[PDB]
Amino acid sequence: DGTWQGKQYLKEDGSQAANEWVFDTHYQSWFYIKADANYAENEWLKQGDDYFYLKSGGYMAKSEWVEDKGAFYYLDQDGKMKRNAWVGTSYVGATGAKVIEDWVYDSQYDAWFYIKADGQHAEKEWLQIKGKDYYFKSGGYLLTSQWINQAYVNASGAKVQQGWLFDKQYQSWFYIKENGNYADKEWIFENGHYYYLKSGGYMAANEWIWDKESWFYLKFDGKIAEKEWVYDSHSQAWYYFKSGGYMAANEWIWDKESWFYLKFDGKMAEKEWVYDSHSQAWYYFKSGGYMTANEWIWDKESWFYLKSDGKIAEKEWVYDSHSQAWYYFKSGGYMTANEWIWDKESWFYLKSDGKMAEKEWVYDSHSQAWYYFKSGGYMAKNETVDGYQLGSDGKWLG
Ligand SMILES: C[N+](C)(C)CCO
Ligand SMILES: C[N+](C)(C)CCO
Ligand SMILES: C[N+](C)(C)CCO
Ligand SMILES: C[N+](C)(C)CCO
Ligand SMILES: C[N+](C)(C)CCO
Ligand SMILES: C[N+](C)(C)CCO
Ligand SMILES: C[N+](C)(C)CCO
Ligand SMILES: C[N+](C)(C)CCO
Ligand SMILES: C[N+](C)(C)CCO
Ligand SMILES: C[N+](C)(C)CCO
Ligand SMILES: C[N+](C)(C)CCO
Ligand SMILES: C[N+](C)(C)CCO
Ligand SMILES: C[N+](C)(C)CCO
Ligand SMILES: C[N+](C)(C)CCO
Ligand SMILES: C[N+](C)(C)CCO
Ligand SMILES: C[N+](C)(C)CCO
Ligand SMILES: C[N+](C)(C)CCO
């Protein structure tokens, strides 16, 4: 072909070569003869948008790296420099410089990679990049919008930390803890409200939860129920929950304007009697749970009176202004009727409807006699009324 003459290259025709590539077969290499008829060495050449590098001796660098003032560049088989391409496990940017410690998006793979301190791309490992945690699978691809063991990586590949996320395929809410794993059997406070995450992390919604000593109920949106009533259509009963969400059970509660009482199991007492154990008295609740107080109730063959404060009237007298008469209640609240009783110092008779005899003549069929009672129900015994004598025992003598 041609003949080397020092730095010069005389071609077949004598004319020394310049501004041209020549392939010499002895050296088995490409060389570039500059414009000054010398071969290029230890320098870059720009031809088109292509960059070549010619090593000591003029040999064109091909399939190898070339360090330019700290930065590293790769020259392919044709001697050309590479751009936005993978050289094995490393990456060259649009300037052809080796990327080290930075993010990389490759449109060919439609994925993200991170190049590490060693110039290699991360693979099958967790890395903490400027605070956040990212995961790369086999091949270096960055994982996005999915679950890894107990963590979730958002659409950006970052691990979620201290956040709420909704899985549409599971149809449940999860809270991701500060540590990166989801909450598991614990209470979480979010914007003024408490939520309970269940054994799988699934947020508890419309269900009962037992913590340490009492019951909690979680509503439609998973919020703890507190300071309110909830009707259990399964259990067919009303429950109440207080300041902390604690269901109240074996204790009393004021709501609307009525006292209420909640039984051992948190069921509101309704249409029934209850016996307080620290008050040692009986109480009765209407249909709807409302404490009856100062009003009559008819249970089984007996009338009862519950006074201004709701306690049962028993071994005591009561005036009832609505019916305008006096009544007496025995041991147990049993209102007395068609009976005598000894109180004060005189006798008292209570009519069939329970009303005490007050200012009237009454025929006791029992003793077959006519008795009279003065204002206040006091039987008359040794005196005259309307010219009618009365004996030592109260009977009419005549
Ligand atoms: C110095 N390089 C030629 C390698 C890059 C500048 O374009
Ligand atoms: C072939 N080289 C360019 C290396 C030397 C010729 O003198
Ligand atoms: C270096 N070669 C001449 C072989 C290719 C440049 O286009
Ligand atoms: C982009 N990968 C690292 C997966 C391939 C390198 O050739
Ligand atoms: C650059 N990343 C996409 C990897 C994270 C920020 O969005
Ligand atoms: C969906 N998670 C796997 C995060 C919880 C169930 O185990
Ligand atoms: C706890 N979240 C606020 C995420 C759900 C409300 O229902
Ligand atoms: C049980 N909680 C933590 C939900 C309430 C405390 O007041
Ligand atoms: C006894 N409660 C109704 C409160 C809980 C049922 O699981
Ligand atoms: C107060 N309750 C909700 C228990 C009943 C009202 O009708
Ligand atoms: C006193 N009542 C009429 C309500 C009941 C009769 O058994
Ligand atoms: C029923 N009361 C609330 C009136 C007293 C019970 O402690
Ligand atoms: C229920 N009693 C009959 C006791 C009185 C009603 O006015
Ligand atoms: C009928 N009371 C409930 C008032 C008493 C039970 O012995
Ligand atoms: C004077 N009595 C009222 C006792 C009887 C008259 O019928
Ligand atoms: C006060 N009464 C006369 C109404 C009965 C109890 O002594
Ligand atoms: C009221 N007495 C007891 C005096 C007569 C009825 O037995």
PDB file of C-alpha atoms and ligand atoms in Angstrom, residues 340-342 347-349 364 366-367 369 371 373 379 392-395, ligand 17:
ATOM      1  CA  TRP A 340    -104.207  -2.464 105.365  1.00  0.00           C
ATOM      2  CA  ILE A 341    -100.879  -1.300 106.751  1.00  0.00           C
ATOM      3  CA  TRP A 342     -99.805   0.046 110.150  1.00  0.00           C
ATOM      4  CA  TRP A 347    -104.029   2.289 110.293  1.00  0.00           C
ATOM      5  CA  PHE A 348    -104.151   2.956 106.549  1.00  0.00           C
ATOM      6  CA  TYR A 349    -106.172   1.234 103.848  1.00  0.00           C
ATOM      7  CA  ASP A 364    -114.102  -3.378 103.853  1.00  0.00           C
ATOM      8  CA  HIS A 366    -112.897  -8.563 104.418  1.00  0.00           C
ATOM      9  CA  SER A 367    -113.981  -7.482 107.935  1.00  0.00           C
ATOM     10  CA  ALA A 369    -117.442  -3.094 108.176  1.00  0.00           C
ATOM     11  CA  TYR A 371    -114.546   2.568 108.155  1.00  0.00           C
ATOM     12  CA  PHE A 373    -110.543   7.997 107.061  1.00  0.00           C
ATOM     13  CA  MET A 379    -108.502   5.903 110.132  1.00  0.00           C
ATOM     14  CA  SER A 392    -112.096   1.126 119.395  1.00  0.00           C
ATOM     15  CA  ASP A 393    -111.265  -0.763 116.232  1.00  0.00           C
ATOM     16  CA  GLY A 394    -112.480   1.695 113.564  1.00  0.00           C
ATOM     17  CA  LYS A 395    -115.755  -0.058 112.746  1.00  0.00           C
TER      18      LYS A 395
HETATM   19  C1  LIG B  17    -108.010  -2.238 110.274  1.00  0.00           C
HETATM   20  N1  LIG B  17    -108.171  -3.274 111.286  1.00  0.00           N
HETATM   21  C2  LIG B  17    -106.953  -4.102 111.389  1.00  0.00           C
HETATM   22  C3  LIG B  17    -108.410  -2.583 112.555  1.00  0.00           C
HETATM   23  C4  LIG B  17    -109.321  -4.137 110.937  1.00  0.00           C
HETATM   24  C5  LIG B  17    -109.087  -4.930 109.642  1.00  0.00           C
HETATM   25  O1  LIG B  17    -108.451  -6.201 109.911  1.00  0.00           O
END
